[PDB]
């Protein structure tokens, strides 16, 4: 535990290179001095056959170190360039060849730009879509006993830890929340347990949001005790 | 070393979801467009039984990805909500169900709010409390020789690496510091070594702070050589 | 994959301590209250023999958690101190002794300042320097066929994925780029393949930059197909 070792020197070295690369101030005192600091990252300033570049003042707005593999670090970069004057926001992937000598780091050649790749998945089957459209086969009198219990549960859940402890196992109260409404309830028996799949509305500051729950309910006296609580409803919820 | 592989795509995907979730601009062109980008994170936009939510403009101020386990990412979140107009700062825990398909990621259902949990430890025994209250059994003449040596040590420590090298093994000088005072010294023999437990005051810019040291001192000529330096004093320091 | 476990509670605990340590507001309501929050990090507020410190208002500008080892966390810190009034930017290394009790954390004693250490490597042999100075032994008629092909390649590379797919294996187009010029070409046979070591200039927004490439070219009809593309030129490129 407390004796674990972490070394983030490489990740922060690469962050410092990205900052040095995408940062160019306006005033010359500042500008050539920032270029010297950028050049300090290389083993050797890369050999460039062009006479020079067109350079505009620029500010780094954001960077994400997404991958390191095979001595290449890949970033997502957001920056702004002042063209003399208009300011333009730009994004690019940015790829840094680097290496290590005696536990120290350097950039080993000209970096390269790439198109940002999204890690967003797509192409899902409609079989994977949760819809809370099922109607359960539990009595209207059990529904009304469960609804009364759930209103007490969510009131305690948003207010009072000791009140919540009496009716639930190892559930923490939430902060800065008001319980508004129960919007869906599907009930299913599992031997002596009653399973409740529930959606409810909460207000935090001035904003409302909905959340899902799976309650495992045991009968206690004339009410219930929550032996288990989850914060998702599974696709198979209405498979009884 | 330099060929290590790092993949942070999941951590930054989740950061981008938190930003998309807690960011809502004022102007409609911007607002519905930010909602579309938020919706792009889901496999399917979650089924919500309420007609709609009350939504206010909001800005993300800070987020910490504290845990990922069992396909749930947990954040500490700081944001501000503009209620039309007053601005209110809010904090919450925020829990994201997600999954992975073919090396890509998605949010799999309604996230849930939780109370922020502190990782601060408490309930310590007074046995664990360091107090620099002990009086050593070393002569006043050794104390004065050690005090003179320690003033040279701390002067060099704050000034001159080559001067420091003559009187200490593998100690680096500190930058931007002035040595002010030695505030505590406990001396103890360990065979031929003299151990010095020391607190001293330093000034950095306009501010003073105290630090602790454990010196291991060897006799060199009519003075000392520091064979070892630590930056803590142990609870057992006055167990001779 | 999606079931991986991450725990960053220690790293963010230490970030919160650094923020608490280097943050001191102006107004007393705020100031003594920030000191109480700072003191909450310790198992016990450290025993300090000085009567007190000189404290000035201060803001944390940046911090990097570079190492954790042997119950010491080491940071690079940037802050600013208001001396009453002038503002001064300062940098320091900052070292935190900490420990863990029952999965929770605490700071165990007085932290210590250190000089920032750069992870920049130096002292390279000129043998390791890439210079694009070699002249190849390939015919001027092959050079002109390759130059025409490379202008098509870089046009597609900056424009049209489907056009690029016809002439290259698994190469992604770049975004927001205009191809300007080929500035260096070294050609070498490798059995039936032709290797091209190339530098080219690109414009992104208002700014130009150079990049290096190693193409592996197969003959296709009266032109070429790129079977492999790298974004570096190796030191041995002109060893035929």
Author numbering:
A (entry chain A), B (entry chain A), C (entry chain A): 86 to 169, 174 to 329
Article sentences:
The main model of our study is OrfG, the sole VirB8-like protein of the conjugative and integrative element ICESt3 found in the Gram-positive bacterium Streptococcus thermophilus. Bioinformatic analysis using constrained consensus TOPology prediction (CCTOP) predicted that OrfG consists of a single transmembrane α helix (residues 37 to 57) followed by a large soluble domain (OrfG64–331). This soluble region comprises two NTF2-like domains OrfG64–204 and OrfG223–331 (referred to hereafter as D1 and D2, respectively). Our data confirm that VirB8-like proteins are predominantly extracellular components, assembling into a conserved pattern, which serves as a building block of the DNA translocation channel.
We determined the crystallographic structure of OrfGExt at a resolution of 1.83 Å. As anticipated, it exhibits two NTF2-like domains D1 and D2, connected by a long-extended linker. In domain D1, the region between residues 92 and 204 forms two successive α helices followed by a long loop (instead of a third α helix typically observed in VirB8 and VirB8-like proteins) and then a highly curved antiparallel β sheet composed of four strands wrapped around the first α helix. The domain D2 (residues 228 to 321) adopts a similar fold to domain D1 [root mean square deviation (RMSD) = 2.57 Å for 78 aligned residues] but with a shorter α helix 2 and shorter loops between the strands and once again lacks a third α helix before entering the β sheet. A notable feature common to these two domains is the high proportion of aromatic residues in their core, predominantly phenylalanines and tyrosines (D1: four Phe + four Tyr; D2: seven Phe + two Tyr), at the interface between the helix 1 and the β sheet. In the crystal, OrfGExt forms a complex consisting of three intertwined protomers related by a threefold axis. The six NTF2-like domains are arranged in an almost flat triangle, with three domains D1 in the center and three domains D2 at the vertices. The notable feature of this arrangement is that each domain D1 not only faces the others (distance from center to center: 30 Å) but interacts with the domain D2 of the neighboring monomer (at 24 Å) instead of its own one positioned far away (52 Å), thanks to the long linker that stretches to wrap around the domain D1 of that neighbor. The D1 domains show minimal interaction (273 Å2 in OrfG, 444 Å2 in TcpC) and do not significantly contribute to the trimer stability, while the D1:D2′ interface represents a sufficient contribution to maintain the assembly (910 Å2 in OrfG, 965 Å2 in TcpC). In the crystal structure of OrfG, the trimers display no discernible interactions between them that could suggest a higher-order assembly.
